[model samples]
Target: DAEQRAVAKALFDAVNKHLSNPFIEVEMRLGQFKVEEDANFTACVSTEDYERIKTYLMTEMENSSMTRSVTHDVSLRGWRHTYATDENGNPTRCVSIVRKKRLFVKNIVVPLGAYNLRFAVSTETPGDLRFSGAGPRAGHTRLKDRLSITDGMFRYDMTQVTEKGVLMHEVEIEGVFSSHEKQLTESWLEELLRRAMRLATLR
Candidate 1:
């Protein structure tokens, strides 16, 4: 629950920042895409385990065919307000804001500017969260057929962050081509995950 709240706050902050500074250039390189598939997972780790996994991932990423790899940290702060009703016909809302800084210990990517900041809005419901965002490419519309993960011009990125004792793992591959490349990307992702998991077991 705490993690969820933290994410919500960061997203809210990002949205406001984008809106307030809407005049900035939103640029996308050629072969850029606004569509992609993302897979996420989490695990708890001790400080030692965290370091081991981080080292493993960094080494693996360095050897991959990625064009850019950056390891950095992000500072985030924001507020959230929720409105609800009481049984006695009373209305109430809760508002809160928080600030947090987390490390992106590992970030690996393939292709040009594939890791640029893409403006997006995310909403959280009772037990669900949804995000909608677009890259810098102008005049790009959302793609239809939400049922599959194939067919798009793509790029791959893997991210790892640690908050308290929770280790977060995220993988995203996007493109504007067809399904032929899906297996290639997926295989690489799977291997990365497998190696990370194997290391986690060691500590």
Candidate 2:
């Protein structure tokens, strides 16, 4: 387990080194979401576009016969705390609690609570270099069970925002059932590092 943690740390460090821009901030959060059912996916979007995204999600849910009768909450507000930046003006780490307000079902409102957590770091490049992780929580058990995800299951994502404000994302989903889970994390970290490197080169 110690080795796993070390590997994860190493991967994070490598990404930071490669992306080395003045660290602006790092946000780590644990939040609650009220949904119709379990969800297993990663997403990176601008806060401004979240409303449109919500509407699209609801529309898709309505189109699905299985979820036509299901109501869901679309709240995305949360609480966050910031930490001091490192000597190089990079945020060391931060934590937060997420709380969403509105609850909706198919087209109606409802009441429910789902929990999600994440640790994140962001760099310069406008919206380029970023690293984040979802933490284990009590509410995660349902999705974990449904998806058959064990402790070793992890997901990583990288999002790039174009100057025109378009969002581009790359995601990695992996299941590390063995001691090699550390390596898996590192692999995904490398994947993101390479993308940032390429973008930097182009600019």
Candidate 3:
């Protein structure tokens, strides 16, 4: 178990060293359809193209018999759906709702130049290079049969323009495991990370 853990850790460490941003931000969510029946459906398109898309979806749903659904709230608005369950509690495929929302960007600033901030922890050197607050391994859980890497710090710079009238803004998230953690596992970590996001929405 110890050896296996070490090997996994090594693999993880190597993979993380090559990611775009180890500190990736994720958003999780779930949707419930108000309808109570079986319905075949297609994907949703933006509101501007809704008329055409809606016509297409309606024709498609009529041919295939289905519908699209979603959830709209203040803090966040996104897609969602509902389905009927079998005797064993398995989804029987269904659909219901469709909508979109306005973007709420807070502020804006000039675009920022991206820079890489190396996060390294020396094994032998003191004051060589170390994180100040809640170092990567601070709340790390020791491994028994599993090697778990806690959050680590990596530098990243990005910008975005939103409908909320925010300007060229710079946002930085410090001290977190790089995005590569997901790829190290069976899948791209997108679904696993999605579960975490769903939990956050419930809270």
Candidate 4:
């Protein structure tokens, strides 16, 4: 039965793109998909996981600073007061993200909705992907400190994590972010800064 289920899953995967997973036990269907995978399978790692996991990490960062009300400078206003203009030209609350440089405190007006924060950061030293134990969730896992093993090659434990417990999300191959979030993040942020700076200097 288990083996047959695996076969069903394989057949489902090999065929067309249906957004459901094969659960032989859940109730067999002629067709429907609802399962996912990793980084290369990472490609298989859906937006669902990417968004939630990214939110998980980012929220943790904010929570760390949230209590103390520690605000690092970045934008035109402080976080709470941050705002952006809409396409029709109206004010809206912008997503105010704070990170060390947790060191600075500022604010800005991001463009439209859910704009990409991608390719915005500069990559620092290689933080090797170390696996300690597993995670609370099955088939899912977090990372480790500077340790090594298994796969014969070392990957980043995190693309970017810091003493402040801040993390940046750049999914492996999904282009959730590429190295240019290196160029993208930094330059993207550069423009963000320029835009705000322009606002400050003029206004």
Candidate 5:
């Protein structure tokens, strides 16, 4: 019976593209795939299945409580490229050409999204020190220290006070990630700084 089910699953997968919504067991055996080797099978269920699995996954993720948060300054750069145009008045028949570049600096906060696909920020701290741990929840750590400066020019041994002092000397203002935010990326950080500076310098 199991062998028959596996065969059925293989057939289902092969024709899954034709199915508007394919349904399969949540914990389907990897061997059930048509491929002889595990490496050959990239298991990706239909969107409907994903939606269904997401509900259970969310429940498990919430119970899992694994959370990790860290802070570090990241340098960001951006460039603007212009499309090329032919000398003719008509639109270019060939591929569009791109050129030109621009650059700037900015501060930012990044929040890596959570599991169970929750976008909410699990925890946050106002202090300058970086905090990180890995376990069932985000807080468990067998390591020596939970807070360590993972990035920037700060020495792990140095105190937060010293780090803040150095940063103050370097930049006019320091920006911290929003505790309410779920996730932040490098580009987001740069934009935040750019907008803030613009607002402050507004005539």
Candidate 6:
């Protein structure tokens, strides 16, 4: 015996023993659909266009999808679904229900000159500065990943009536990674990382 079968069985079971297909299927679907979040915000548009934009936003946020995770509930409007599989059993066509929280917004308009920016760079600090610290990293990606919400700190810029000049309004909303939502993402990423790690070290 090469004894590899034992290793194969152990490793195979380690990975496949988990709901690989079910997880993979869910992962694939999440790639195409929305998983939602706790506190969220919207991009700025003309406040004049806010009403219509909000209508479209409502249509987008009032979301629902069927899967093995969630089923029949009370006090909720009966949403017609096209389909599901038994979440109980092996769940052949298994899926999970993903729902987005209701959106609430704060309409705000900041006054002109409320914010200004200027750069201050010095050559002497170069020696003291760690180039890597200033190199490739997420610090350079500030405002790139819009996750987490604290108070009403997030910014959603909106445009106002602009004829002679420009005006910007800041509006806020609530949405993003609830506890359960985080599980899906974390698990999904973990699986990906697992696969990548295995492949990288493969014989």
Whose lDDT is greatest here? 1
For residue 170, model 3's alpha carbon misses the true position, in angstroms, by 26
Worst 10 residues of 5 by lDDT: 114-123
Best by TM-score: 1
Residue 176, candidate 6: Cα error in Å is 2.9
TM-score (C-alpha) between model 1 and the true structure: 0.23
Tens digits of per-residue lDDT for model 4, 119-180: 11111221112221111122222221221111111111112211235333223211122232
| Global fold similarity of model 2 (TM-score) | 0.20
The number of clashing residue pairs in model 6 is: 13
Tell me the spans in candidate 6 whose CA falls farther than 4 Å from its real position.
1-43, 60-168, 171-175, 184-203
Global lDDT of each model?
Answer: 0.30, 0.29, 0.26, 0.24, 0.23, 0.24
Residue-level error in angstroms, candidate 3, position 158: 29
Per-residue CA lDDT of candidate 3, range 41-78, in tens? 21112233323423433443343423222211111123
Residue 129 displacement in candidate 5 (angstroms): 25
Residue-wise lDDT of candidate 5 within 111-180, one digit each (tens)? 2321111011111112211221111122211111112221221111111111223321001112233321
Model 4, CA-based lDDT: 0.24
Please give, for residues 108-182, the per-residue lDDT of candidate 2 as tens digits. Answer: 111232123333444312221121122222121111000111122332222232212343322222232233223
Candidate 2: which stretches are off by over 4 Å?
A: 1-4, 32-116, 124-203
lDDT of candidate 3 vs native? 0.26
Off by more than 4 A, model 1? 1-42, 65-196
Model 3 lDDT at residue 108: 12
> TM-score, each model?
0.23, 0.20, 0.16, 0.16, 0.16, 0.17
lDDT of 6 by residue, 14-113 (tens): 4342332221212100010121254233233334444453344335433422111222211112211111223441112212222222121111222242
lDDT of 6 at 30: 5
